[PDB]
């Protein structure tokens, strides 16, 4: 009922269970050329 208590209201629950084909994203910075840098191209360091 839309007027009952707070924990007596419908709560939607999604449970994520983990077990290699799903990872988090990889953040790509910028390419700066003509400077001595410390690169990581796709795991090639």
């Amino acid at each position: 009922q839309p007027t009952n208590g707070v924990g007596y209201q419908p709560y939607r629950v999604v449970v994520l269970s983990f077990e290699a084909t799903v990872c988090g994203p990889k953040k790509s910075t910028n390419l700066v050329k003509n400077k001595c840098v410390n690169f990581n191209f796709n795991g090639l360091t």
Partner: antibody, heavy 117, light 108 residues
Framework: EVQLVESGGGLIQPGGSLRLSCAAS????????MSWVRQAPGTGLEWVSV???????FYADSVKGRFTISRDNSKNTLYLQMDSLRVEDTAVYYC???????????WGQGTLVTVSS | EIVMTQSPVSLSVSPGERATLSCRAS??????LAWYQQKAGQAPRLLIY???TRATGIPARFSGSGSGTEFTLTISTLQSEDSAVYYC?????????FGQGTKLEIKR
């Protein structure tokens, strides 16, 4: 035939131990939902414990740690072992069959325990 | 928890007067109430479950209803075997707390 006949009551010292029994009729103790309830004068009717099909033993917060329930599967019996009984534990104990954990469907006749010096 | 309170704690009523008993629930439950009757040295039967349904063999004398914060049981024709203790109990809150008991007797 619905019967819930109880036993195990008697006079014990404060700080002693005893053991209850609730023989059930025509339904299964270990597979149905039932509960141990108490009634003392001056206080209201009070829930003590509830027991599930296999499930879990759920106690009151006042008696948690002190009472234990161990149903014995040889017949339709339900027990409760009472250890470290306090002074306020003079009550008649009832075994009551539940509709899960909603409401008390059926009751016993109760066995009354008096603890005193 | 819901701490129960019966307002008509003791009611002496003529043999058949359509007597009125009540309780209030200190929290908000929609219709989560069951009414109980404990007789003298007997097993306390349920009377009403869900605050609007008569369970098994409970007659049309009992017309208990109510919601939210006020609940009322109506007893109609008052045989002398109804001189008993009337409880009201919620379904919603663990731990379950019973009513304090309504002592109903018939004057002779």
């Amino acid at each position: 035939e619905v019967q819930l006949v109880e036993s195990g009551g008697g006079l014990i010292q404060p700080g002693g131990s005893l053991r209850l029994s609730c023989a059930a009729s025509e339904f299964i103790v270990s597979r149905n939902y039932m509960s141990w309830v108490r009634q003392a004068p001056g206080t209201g009717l009070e829930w003590v414990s509830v027991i599930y099909p296999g499930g879990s033993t759920f106690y009151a917060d006042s008696v948690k740690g002190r009472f234990t329930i161990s149903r014995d599967n040889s017949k339709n019996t339900l027990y409760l072992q009472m250890d470290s009984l306090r002074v306020e534990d003079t009550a008649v104990y009832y075994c009551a069959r539940d509709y899960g954990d909603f409401y008390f469907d059926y009751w016993g006749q109760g066995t009354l325990v008096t603890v005193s010096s | 928890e819901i701490v129960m309170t019966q307002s008509p704690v003791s009611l002496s009523v003529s043999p058949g007067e359509r007597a009125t008993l009540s309780c209030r629930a200190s929290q908000g439950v929609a219709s989560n109430l069951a009414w109980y009757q404990q007789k003298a040295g007997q097993a306390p039967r349920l009377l009403i479950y869900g605050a609007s349904t008569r369970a098994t063999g409970i007659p049309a004398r009992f017309s208990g209803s109510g919601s939210g914060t006020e609940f009322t049981l109506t007893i109609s024709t008052l045989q002398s075997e109804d001189s008993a203790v009337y409880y009201c109990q919620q379904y919603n809150d663990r731990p379950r707390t019973f009513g304090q008991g309504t002592k109903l007797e018939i004057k002779r």
